Each structure stands twice: as structure tokens, then as C-alpha cells.
Symmetry: D2
Subunit: 341 residues, 4 copies
């Protein structure tokens, strides 16, 4: 059908707690690009850190970085035959240039080439009715994967997956996972699938119930900095606020590994005496690469990864974001029904 | 003959000053030997012990850069194998030799309940005699003097361990912050592994020393306003917040930072930035006994030329003050354990 | 009780297919050593390669390198209190010096210091009533581990375990195991425990039945060099004769890993064109380290590793070796009842 | 103007000789560009193709060290971005850019059914014009001439890929067997990464060339009777049995051997010895596009000085014979694609 000249888009402005729905000129696809009519857009906590200030990005942007849609317009170099009408596609969040040094080494999650940015961090995001995508950054969603699970596997599944491959854990590893939410429950599933013994914490009774439901060999209901160390091979702190980071660096093994996978706090402090004497390793992990994306989609098709999404109204995004901050969402949430504006 | 008490320096918990007393000459247990101290290197970690940022139990002797001569044998030790008059160096961490960490090869990380590191509990080097588990001694190659050998076990060994953790070669570009006793050896080690070396210290003679030893670039200034030069590796051998902040701005994306120093007991980083750029922060502590062997090779061969000066045993307290005030050229080491 | 002045020992002589039982002066323990009265000695195929020539060692030696016994005499430096009467100990096969560069780096499986050799490869082995052991190379057998399983975990379990840690496989890896025998069935168990998808081959119906019984997700009954490649992450060839090596290098993944874990053939040929273009990796693996030994004994106590041994008569060693060459032994076999000479 | 046929060298399956014919000037497809060849390096792998030990489909053009100038644009390619008159180098493996292996970064290992490596099927360099997927072109830095640039994509790139697989630094001690076109660059690369380098070739001028370029030790003789000198790493860039046997005797315990050459299509090792000593044998093929970028940097900066001579296009068959008889000093590269 006909692509419109203007669509509705949630615009962020540096200084406002809420997103403003506005009228955006629908983008015309550049060379090597297409226009996606959004089918499902995942809501992510990082967007609350943006709206709150703790992760600053350019103003006057459309947020949203968990993107799934169909191609409805084609730029130069894209042959319409290559990308058929009706086919569901998922976008590679980081939106890599695909030809720079970070990209060509793998590590295209870390692209910082100057003619693009990460989705929902400047480049027009998922909280709108249409957005651009470079063809190189689109993956065909395998039949049987719903649009909503497909959206959230680009970040809620992808990110802990990339981090856990960093962790090089296996059936003899014993790992700890702090914070069990959108990423967290996927984190449990993928650690369990890699084979590791898993223990999981999260304040929400619902989220611990999901983790016990998902194979977490131990779902703890408490965790104080006087519960002596169980010397895990690997701690994934997926909230990463000073409270949980302190807990993690006490609970990890000598010469162990801690990944602060969350953006709970823009600064973070560690005991240096201990870090040094026990040769602790803290590793940054950011999103995941496009190879990682191909792999996780394979595993979601295989039923190994079974993401836990819920649908919601596009028009309700702001309200939905409110309930995310108060933590009244079971696992992740995804906007659908974009034509209800 | 072996006296029954000897003179030692005891850190008591609560004094910024070690006090010199008579301390009992311990009996060499099984597999142990009693050494008369020949050179005891002076490490800044000892100012951290005294000033209280690093806690060791009290009633303790604090030196941990140890070289000496066998002078009494415990049950199990063949004097043919470990002759009197032979200069040995001690392995500072003092591993047990048998636990999971020791058999891993990570024996710098031994926490076997049988022993503790030298000078963090176990009778360290700031005395006339100490004990050594002879699995933890290494024969000082002829040509290597006691002073340089004593510095080799820490001021060389520790940066050498760290820089092999860092996996750098002739193609790497790195930055070293801090050019004292560890730092100048760190310049030497990184150059021997091939890395292009950038170096910064506040002391001008430390900077010139880094120039002397082949540092490709000596920054005379380094502030947070300077643009990042994107090093593969940054070894911050100061490890206060100032230097850590610089290290995390100046390290390349997905790069490595090792805070090798103990300048501050707590450190904080930019979590947005460590996450987004997937930065690696790794602790690195002392060195392994395999590392010890390797570095004594590299010192014998002249690849490493540890920079030392000698002072009197009796002057330890004065020179430790000189070190806190940054007035030691590189590393100082005590000689003449008889003058008292 | 009283240690005797002479005991019975199976001596190998370069040139004879059979071991000769002889009268050996019982060894007097050196400094840091003890004398072990053997409780259980595992029989290993490598001993058939020694007897057959394909793995040459000094003549006039006692073979046997899977050793379990009790301490009955103490050398200088060993305090009798430290090593109590009646306690079962297992020996570290490679018999490392424990202070050289190979030893101090881990890798003490690769000790080649000049004042010792591997058990059953020069240094007096397990096919006798008593043998020496350095205290550093003895591990207390945890209560509940029988002497026979304890013997075979020093090599039948240890060796594939060390190799598979080399392989860095996890719940997402898919690996292939050729040859399912003494090592082979332990190999299956430990791959399954590390999490990997496992497919296993062996000519013996009994041994494939054991592998299907032990968790092998696929137990193949055939394998020809025209079964097209299933592109395994990792192939463990535990027979390593040219037949199986060719199979392995075709079946492995691009940039995959092949370990020839067997001594089936002293020479071995590979297609160089393929090895190069697909960046294949062939890795030698030998026995395992003493850290590895501590770990496998932990896991055997934990019931994770459940070795499959059978007892036999010391006096029947030679006959037993005959049935090993014709492959009429289910899994591994261990000599017991040493006082039946 | 772009001709509709050009002159090319076709390997036909069954001849030890490539034959020169007219071959159609292919039309640049989507994302592709048609280049006029400016320099085509001559690789010994081509003698292996001709002599039959390495099989490529027939009716093929065999050059794979490719540099040239854009001269026609296919659908999708902006001439502003890829100007005529600009010297590009091609990435020999010619990856698809999008498959699992390409996104891994292991794009030297691409086996996407869309394409194949240059000169093993895809219209290689032994002709006047070829096609390039412009994701697979790299702009030749000014100062770098076509000849050296064409050699940089293979004779430099391949040992550079291999030696980074080998993880060596200023502390490593290695041996290189084979000092032709790959080998002399391999000496340069290992020296740039810091390794102590030992080198052996049969040709004396190859040995002297290795001396020229800083090889620490040039063996004038190497036989199996020689004692093992226990190298961390051995790169056998001959890879016949003779040289492989030497490599596996001379490599240290738990050490690395890479048989980089294609001297023999099958190789055998001592299984007792590979097992007992836990030897690592690793294949290494071409280089990645990240590797390509890095090496063009290192050549521009003068860290790598690839050793080339130029000959006429028309003489390819004569010089390939000269190469089989070991009579090329290092690497030769074809110029003057107009003289015919
Ligand atoms: N690339 C990355 O590193 C990356 C990618 C995506 C998201 N993130 C960050 O991961 C974090 C979580 O992501 P999400 O979208 O799943 O958030 P979410 O709101 O879906 O899940 C949050 C969970 O955090 C739990 N929690 C909060 N504080 C806790 C505590 N102190 N102890 C135990 N549990 C606690 C809550 O109970 C909730 O179940 C956010 O910071 C998000 O921005 C990082
Ligand atoms: N296992 C380990 O990781 C390990 C082992 C031993 C020592 N250390 C630590 O290494 C650090 C240095 O030890 P040392 O004995 O070499 O000290 P030192 O006294 O010999 O010299 C330290 C150098 O730091 C320089 N410096 C101090 N602050 C600086 C700054 N803000 N910017 C630039 N340079 C600065 C000083 O000028 C001096 O040149 C100490 O914290 C010590 O405890 C760590
Ligand atoms: N450190 C080491 O690398 C190390 C250590 C111990 C043993 N080994 C070697 O491992 C090999 C096996 O050890 P084991 O003691 O378990 O032997 P074993 O006799 O107990 O088991 C042998 C198994 O090999 C199977 N087999 C033989 N040829 C086969 C083939 N072509 N295809 C499929 N299966 C085949 C047999 O059916 C039998 O089940 C021997 O070479 C042994 O010496 C190596
Ligand atoms: N991807 C790869 O791994 C890859 C890529 C390109 C080329 N290659 C292979 O590299 C090998 C060499 O290529 P080149 O172009 O450098 O060859 P070249 O003709 O330039 O020189 C090869 C050198 O080998 C020396 N040599 C031959 N036999 C020797 C021996 N027995 N002992 C010592 N030296 C000997 C010759 O004297 C000559 O100096 C060939 O097999 C080539 O196919 C591999
Ligand atoms: Zn997100
Ligand atoms: Zn990029
Ligand atoms: Zn110190
Ligand atoms: Zn220990
Ligand atoms: Zn065996
Ligand atoms: Zn040893
Ligand atoms: Zn080539
Ligand atoms: Zn590809």
C-alpha cells in the first residue's frame, strides 16, 4: 500500500520526564536502506535512564531500540524483490556501519562510525509508526517467532547472551544473577542453556517465581552483604547500583568475573584492595553483535530461548513507562497496534 | 651461630611508624630454612600499611622484598641442596605449594590457612633473620647482587605479572602512570615485550628515568581535559582517583586498564562508559613463582636493569618518610643489617 | 604391619609381548616419599601399545599407571601422623617433580624433570604389590569412592577431562566422540556434564549401549567418510588411527578443533589443503594436571562423574591384557586382590 | 572506454601451463566495480594450482594479489565515493560480507554460495580487468605503489594473520622456515611484534635477505639431526614433509606449529610426540579484512617494507617457471598490462 507523508512519533527532549507524541515526516530511505512499518517495539529500562538523565543522548530523538517491522519502501541499491512485502524483520539495535574496524573484527556492537548511531540513542527509534533500517542490519524473523518476542530478543535476549559468551561459562561453572527482569529472565534461560549452575536474586516475588519457573537452580529471596561468599565463577549484576555491585564483588570467586550489565547507576565504586589481591575482573558488556543476533534468533526458533513478552498499546507508551519505573511489569513489555493513534 | 633473638621492625596497629625491637629468632620448621637477611627492598605498600589504607595484623614485621643466605636447616632440608653462603631470593606471596591455587599456577593467589604473604603477617624482611619455605626460594644468579635481586621479587615481578596479563606485543600502544620503583621496571618490561610506551609521573627525575630506559613518549603533562590517545592498555601504578579517571579516559574502546597501585582503597568508574565501551578492569597481584623464575632470567641476561640504591638497615624509618615525600629516586633497599 | 623385603612385580622387557612376574626388592622410600601397598591398579590400552612397541619406554620397568593404595612406609620428611594407616590414596600418574617450570605454571602433566618419570613409563608402576609415591603426588580418596573407580579416575577419567577443558565446550557446543571405551564412556559423561550436545561412535555394540545409557544425545552405529559433515565444534578421536583421524578432520567445523586423544597409531596424516583453508586446529592432549585430578575426584564424589570399572585378579593381568587387545572388555578393568600371587 | 573483451590468463584443468586468451569483460553487478588491473602479484600457490596439488575449477583466471583503478560502476556504487584514477587493493578471499563467518570477523573463512576467493574461481588478477565487490576494496595510501600494495594483500597479509594467531611478543623465540615472498615479510612482521627470529631457507640470497631485515639468527643449515632449540612458535612456510618434520622437532613443549605453506597436500606427524608434548598444529588461511586494514597501515608507516620486483604482464608464464625453479629473489608482480 501507500506509505504516508507523516506518522506519529514519540519524541524525547532533554529536560522532560515524558515523551511527546508528535508528527514526524516519514523518512525516505537512503541508499542501502528501507523504511520499516513497525510491527512491535520493545520497552526497555534504559529508556527510563534516558528520560531520567542518567544516560544522556541527543535531544529531539525518537527512543526505542527493540524493533520489528515489515519493509514498505526501498532506497537506492535495495531491490524490492530481495525484501518481499509482508516479511517480518528484526533490526540490529546498535545499527553498525558494517565496514569500519570495529565492525570488521566482529564487535560491531561497538560501532562508532560517524554516519549513524545506535537505535533509540539518536537514530530514529522504535517508538513511532515507521523508521529507517539499513538492509545490512536486518534479520529475517524465522517463521513461528512472534513479532513481540522477536522485538525483545534484539536486546532483552541479545544483551545477556553476548555478556554470557564473554563469561565463558559451562556445565561446571556456577554463576549468580542479580536482578531478574526483562533481561534477567532471559539471562537465567541462557545461562541454564549454556549448562551453568545458576542462582538468581530479584526483589520482585513475581520475578523470582519466573526464575524458579525457568530453571534457576537456586532462587534466593534475600541477599545482604553479610551472607558470606559462595564464590561464584561469574556474577551478572543486571541492576548495577552500588548496593548490588558491592554484593557482587564480595560474592565472586578469587580471580572471578563480574559483569555490571545494568545501567542502574552512572558511577560505580569497588573495593580496590580486594580487586587487586584477588585479581578480580570487571568487564563492560554492551548490547550484542550481529553474529550474536543470528545465533539468538536461531535459538529462539529452536525453543531454547523462550522470551517472556507482553503486548500493550502504542498510545499507552508513557503510562507503560510509568509502571516500569515503579516496577509493576512482570517481564518485558512491547508496544503493538500502532494504528491506534 | 644463630642468635635466639634478632633485631626487627614491628608494625603495631595504630602507629604510622614501625618500631624497632628485639624479636625471637624463629626455629626452622619442616621444609623451612632460617635466612639471615642480606637485602630488604622497601615497597610503597608499606607506607599504605603504616598509614592504614591496607590492613595487616599487628605485632608484625613488614618487609617483603627478601634476599638472604641459608643459616639454619629445618627437618627435611638437605644442606647439600641449599648451601650456606648461597644468595636466595624469596617469593613474596609465600604460597603453600599444594592447594588448588598453587597447582593452578596462580600461586600468587594462595590463601591456604597454613601461611600468609611475607610482610602482611608472615615474618617479613625488616629484620635480621626470617623463615622461608624452601619451595619458595630461588637461587640468585651470579652477577645479580642482593639489592637488585630483592627488588626483582616485587618491583619487577609485579609489573611483569601484570603486563603478561595484558597480552601486549611490539604492535601494542600503552600508557604507564607512575614511574617509581615499580614504574621504571614497568617501562623496561613493556619495552622488552615490544610495546610502544607512553609514560607519565609527577617527578621530573622519574620522567627522565623513563626517558633513559626507552619510553617512546614521556608526557610532561596529563590532565582530564587532554583528548584520549586510545591506548590498548593502561597500567595505572598510582591508582588514586585522579589517575584512574585519566586511565579510563585514555584507554581505547574495549581496551584494558589494570589499576596496579594501592594509592586509594576505593575506586569508582563511569558505568555508562565502562558498559558502552566494554572496558576491561583487571586486578593483578604480586607474581607467580613461574613469573619469578622468568624475571630472574631476564635480569641475569640484562634485559631488565632494576634501578636501586642502598641504605642502612638502621635508617628504615627515615627512608620510609623520604618515600612518602617522593624523595627516593626509584627503589631503595636496605643493606648492612649489622650496623646497630 | 611389616613391609616385606621382596614383592611380586610384573616386569616389561623390550622385546616381549607379555609381562613377566618377578621378585622385586620392595622399595625403601626416599625423602618426601612413601611406599604404597597397592589396593587397585587400572589396566590401560596404552600398556598394550607399550607391549606392542608403538609407544616405546625403557625396558626392565613395571608398567601400570592407574594407582591406588595405602601408605605403609614413610621416607625422610614424611611424618607418619600426616599420612595415617588405612587411608586410601590415589597417585598422580605423570608423577611431576612439582617445582620445575612446567610444574609451577600448572601443566605439571608435562613435567620432564630429570629425577623422575611418568608412572608405568619407567618409574615403578601399578602392576605390582608395592610402589613408591612422592607425597606431593598423592590425593586422599574421598570416603565413598571405591578403590577401583578411584584408580581409573586418575587416567580413564582424568585424561578426557583435561582434554575437554582444553576444548572449551559448553551447553551450546556440539561435539563428536570416536571410540567409546575406558576413556570413551567417561568422555561422554564429562562432555554431557559440561553441557555439550554429544554424538558418539564405537564399533562395540556394548560400548554404544553404554554411551546411549550415559546421555550421548546420538549414538551412531555407522560412520563412513561419505557421511557428509555434521560440522561439530569439537571432535575427540580417542582411538586415533588414520581411519578415525580422517573421519574426524572431515566431520569437524570450519576453524573447529580436533584432539587425537588416542595412541592408536604412532604416525598420523591429515589433508593439509583442508587444514589450511578451514583453519583447523589439532591439539595434543596428555594425561591431566594435578589440579585436574583434584577437580575430577571432587566430581566423582559428587556423583557427576560415575566411572565404570570392573575388578579382576592381579594374577590374571596377562590374560586380561589379551582380552583387551581383542576388545572383549566392556569398559575399563582394574586389578585387585594382590595377595593372590 | 571499457572494452568488451580483455586479455587474460586461463588455467585449464590438466595443463601445467596457463594459456593467454581473450576473455569477456564482465559487467559490474550490484555493489560491484570493474577495475583495470594495475599490479598483479605472483603467488607460489599458483604453481600449486598449475602443478595440480591444489584444485580450482577450470576455465579460470588465477591471479589473487590484486590492485587497480575503478573504471566502471555497477548499480549502487557512488562514483564520488570510489573515484576513477584511485588505486584500490582487493581483499583476496573476497568475502560475502554478510554471512556468519563474515560477521564473526573470520571473513577470510567465508564460504557463502554467492562468490569464491579470487583466483580460485572468481576472475582473478592475471588479466587486464576484473570485478570487485566494493565492500572488498581498500584505498591504497599515497606513497604505497601498486606493486607493494598488491603484495600486501597476500604475501604480507597471510603471515600477518598467522603470526597474530600465534600470539607472540618481544619475549617469544620463533623459527621461520621458508624465506621467499611470504617468508621475508614474515621476518619483518615477527620482528615488528618483537619476537626473536630464527630463519632458514635454502637460497643464500633469501638467507641474506632475512639477515638484511633483522632476523636475529639465520641458520645456514638445518637437519633433523640437529638438537631441538625449543621455539615457542614455528612457522613452516614451506610445508613439505622435510620441513614439517623439522618444525615438530624444533618446537618447544606445548608449543605452536603453523604449517603456512602448501608445499605438499598431505602431512603426517609423530602422534606419540604430539600427544605426549601437547603440541598445537593450527591452520591459517589468507587474512581478514581487519587484518588487511592493519597491514596497509603498517606498510604506509614503513614498519613493513615488502620486497618486490616488477615484470611484464606478457611474461607471466616465463616468470612462473622462474619461480618454480626458485629464481625469483622474493616476490614478483606484473606491471604494464598494455604491452601485448
Ligand atoms: N547493553 C546493556 O548493558 C544493557 C542493555 C539493555 C538493558 N540494560 C540495563 O539492564 C537493566 C535492567 O534491564 P530491564 O530492561 O530488564 O529492566 P526491567 O525493569 O525490565 O527489570 C528490572 C528488574 O530489576 C529488579 N531490581 C531492581 N533493583 C534490584 C535490586 N536491588 N536487587 C534485585 N533486583 C532488583 C527489579 O525487581 C526488576 O525485576 C537496566 O539498567 C537496563 O537499562 C543494559
Ligand atoms: N601487587 C601489586 O599490584 C602491587 C605490588 C607492589 C606495590 N604496589 C603499589 O604500587 C604503587 C607504587 O609503588 P612504588 O613502590 O613503585 O612507589 P614509589 O614510591 O617507588 O614511586 C611511586 C611513583 O608514583 C608517582 N606518582 C604518585 N602520584 C602520582 C600522580 N598522581 N600522578 C603521576 N605520578 C604519581 C610518584 O611520583 C612516584 O614516582 C603503590 O600503590 C604500591 O603499593 C602494587
Ligand atoms: N593421555 C592420553 O592421550 C591417553 C591417556 C590414556 C589412554 N590413551 C589412549 O586412548 C586409547 C583408548 O583408551 P582406553 O584405555 O579406553 O582403550 P579401551 O580398550 O578401554 O577402549 C577402546 C575402545 O576403542 C574402540 N575402537 C577401536 N577402534 C575403533 C574404531 N575404529 N572406531 C570406533 N571405535 C573403535 C573399541 O571398540 C573400544 O570400545 C588408547 O590409545 C589409549 O592408549 C591416551
Ligand atoms: N593462506 C596461506 O596459508 C597461504 C597463502 C599464500 C601462499 N601460501 C604458501 O606459501 C608457500 C610459499 O609461498 P611464496 O609465494 O612465499 O613462495 P616463493 O616462491 O616466493 O618462495 C618460497 C621459498 O621457499 C624456500 N624453500 C623451498 N623449499 C625449502 C626447503 N625445503 N627448506 C627451506 N626453504 C625452502 C624457497 O627457497 C623459497 O625461498 C607456498 O606453499 C604458498 O602456496 C599459503
Ligand atoms: Zn535496551
Ligand atoms: Zn562500524
Ligand atoms: Zn610490594
Ligand atoms: Zn597454596
Ligand atoms: Zn593410561
Ligand atoms: Zn616438574
Ligand atoms: Zn597466495
Ligand atoms: Zn561471508
Amino acid at each position: 500500500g501507500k506509505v504516508p507523508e507523516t506518522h506519529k512519533g514519540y519524541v524525547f527532549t532533554s529536560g522532560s520526564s515524558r515523551l511527546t507524541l508528535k508528527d514526524v515526516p516519514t523518512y525516505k530511505p537512503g541508499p542501502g536502506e528501507v523504511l520499516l512499518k513497525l510491527e512491535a517495539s520493545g520497552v526497555c529500562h534504559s529508556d527510563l535512564h534516558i528520560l531520567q538523565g542518567s544516560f544522556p543522548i541527543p535531544s529531539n530523538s525518537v527512543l526505542g531500540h527493540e524493533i520489528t517491522g515489515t519493509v514498505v519502501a526501498y532506497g537506492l541499491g535495495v531491490d524490492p524483490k530481495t525484501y518481499p512485502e509482508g516479511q517480518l524483520y528484526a533490526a540490529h539495535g546498535p545499527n553498525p556501519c558494517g565496514s569500519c574496524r570495529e565492525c570488521r573484527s566482529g564487535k560491531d556492537n561497538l560501532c562508532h562510525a560517524e554516519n549513524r548511531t545506535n537505535y533509540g540513542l539518536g537514530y530514529p527509534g522504535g517508538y513511532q509508526q515507521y523508521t529507517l533500517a539499513k538492509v545490512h542490519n536486518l534479520i529475517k524473523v524465522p517463521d513461528g517467532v512472534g513479532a513481540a518476542i522477536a522485538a525483545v530478543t534484539t536486546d532483552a535476549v541479545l544483551t545477556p547472551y553476548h555478556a554470557f559468551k564473554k563469561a565463558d561459562i559451562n556445565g561446571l561453572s556456577k554463576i549468580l544473577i542479580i536482578g531478574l527482569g526483562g533481561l534477567g529472565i532471559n539471562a537465567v534461560q541462557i545461562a541454564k542453556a549454556m549448562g551453568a549452575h545458576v542462582t538468581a536474586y530479584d526483589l520482585k516475588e513475581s520475578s523470582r517465581q519466573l526464575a524458579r519457573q525457568f530453571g534457576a537452580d537456586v532462587v534466593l529471596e534475600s541477599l545482604t552483604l553479610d551472607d558470606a561468599s559462595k564464590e561464584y565463577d561469574f556474577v551478572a549484576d543486571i541492576v548495577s547500583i552500588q548496593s548490588t555491585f558491592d554484593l557482587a564483588l564480595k560474592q565472586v570467586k578469587s580471580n572471578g568475573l563480574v559483569i555490571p550489565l545494568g545501567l542502574g547507576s552512572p558511577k560505580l565504586t569497588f573495593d580496590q584492595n580486594d580487586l587487586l589481591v584477588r585479581e578480580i575482573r570487571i568487564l563492560g558488556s554492551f548490547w550484542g553483535t550481529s553474529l550474536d543476533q543470528a545465533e539468538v534468533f536461531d535459538l529462539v526458533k529452536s525453543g531454547a530461548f523462550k522470551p517472556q513478552v507482553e503486548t500493550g498499546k502504542f498510545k499507552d507508551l508513557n503510562e507503560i513507562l510509568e509502571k516500569l519505573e515503579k516496577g509493576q511489569i512482570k517481564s518485558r513489555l512491547v508496544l503493538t497496534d500502532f494504528d491506534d493513534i
